[PDB]
Amino acid sequence: VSLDKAVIARLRKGGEEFEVLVDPYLARDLKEGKEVNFEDLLAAEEVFKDAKKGERASVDELRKIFGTDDVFEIARKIILEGEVQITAEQRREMLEAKRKQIINFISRNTIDPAPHPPSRIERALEEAKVHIDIFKSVEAQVKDIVKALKPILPLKFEEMEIAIKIPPEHTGRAISALYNFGGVTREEWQRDGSWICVMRIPSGMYGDLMDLLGKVAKGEALTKVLRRIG
C-alpha cells in the first residue's frame, strides 16, 4: 500500500500519541476479526509519534508504553483499540458493501412464516433506521439487526435437512455440483450405482436447491424433507 493511499490509525496511550500508516481495507478486515497479512497492511513498518510530520517513535518509548518493540504487535493494538481514520468516501463505500452482504445473508438464511427478496429486506432496514457497523462482520451483527426488524418484518432463521437420491445415470453431473452448493452430509454410493445424501441448507436456499436438482438430474432426483431446524 502506497503512503499516498494509506490512512492513519491512531491510539493515545500513557499521555502520548501513536500512529501507523495502513491500508484502510485491510485495517477494516482486522477490526472485523479476519486474518490479515501484516506485510500488506502496513504502508511503512514503524510506529510514529506524528505520521504526517514523519516523527518516528523510539524503540525505548515503544518498550515502555507497549511493553514491546514489535511493530506488527503494536500496530494490531492501535488498530483494534484506537481509531482508523478512513476517508468519508471509504466509509461510504464500506457501508454500501456491508449493507449488501447483510441483505444477502438475511434473504438467503431466513424465511417468512418463504424467503423475502432483497428489496423487501432493503426497505425494512430503512423503515426501522437500522444502524450498520462497517467494522463488524455480518455474522456478528445480524441478530441485533434482525431483532430490530422484528416489529415491521417478521423474520425467522431456519435450516432444512433434505434427503436426496440421485439415479445412477446422473451421479456424474450431479454429485460434484451438490458439493459446490454446500451442505452435503451422510453421502453414500448405492448398490445399483445410485447415490444418496442429506443436504443441510438455509431454508431460504430451498428453491435454489430444487432448481439445481432439476437441472443436474433432469427431474430424476428424489427428495424428501426430513426436518426444519430453527
Asked if 101 and 138 touch (Cβ cutoff 8 Å), the reply is yes
Q: Which residue type occupies 196?
A: I
- Going from N- to C-terminal start, the domains of the chain cover 6-85, 86-157, 158-230
The experimental method behind these coordinates is X-ray
How far does CA 141 lie from the centroid of its chain?
10
Instruction: Determine the Cα–Cα distance for residues 131 and 134; give it in Å rounded to an integer.
Output: 10
Q: Which residue type occupies 162?
A: I
Per this entry, what is the length of the chain? 230
Contacts of 89-98 with C-beta under 8 Å, sequence gap 24+, read: 90/7, 90/24, 90/25, 91/134, 94/25, 94/28, 94/134, 95/132, 95/134, 98/132, 98/133, 98/134, 98/138
**Residue 78 grid cell:** 492501535
SS3 readout for the chain:
CCCCCCEEEEEEECCEEEEEEECHHHHHHHHHCCCCCHHHHECCCCCEEECCCCEECCHHHHHHHHCCCCHHHHHHHHHHHCEECCCHHHHHHHHHHHHHHHHHHHHHHEECCCCCCHHHHHHHHHHCCCCCCCCCCHHHHHHHHHHHHCCCCCCEECEEEEEEEECCCCHHHHHHHHHHHCCEEEEEECCCCCEEEEEEEEHHHHHHHHHHHHHHCCCCCEEEEEEEEC
Maximum Cα–Cα distance across the chain: 75
CATH superfamily of 86-157: SBDS protein C-terminal domain, subdomain 1 (1.10.10.900)
Give me the torsion for CA of 59, 60, 61, 62, rounded to 10°.
Answer: 40
Q: Please check whether the domain covering 158-230 is classified as CATH 3.30.420.80.
A: no
CATH of domain 6-85: 3.30.1250.10
Report CA Rg, the chain.
Answer: 25
Per-position b or e across 16-37, b if 16+ CB within 10 A of its CB: eebbbbbbbbbbbbbbbeeebe
**Residue 96 grid cell:** 454500501
Resolution to 1 decimal place, in Å: 2.0
Asked if 20 and 45 touch (Cβ cutoff 8 Å), the reply is no
Q: Which residue type occupies 113?
A: P
Sign of torsion, CA 187 188 189 190? Answer: negative
**Residue 156 grid cell:** 425467522
Instruction: Determine the Cα–Cα distance for residues 140 and 2; give it in Å rounded to an integer.
Output: 31
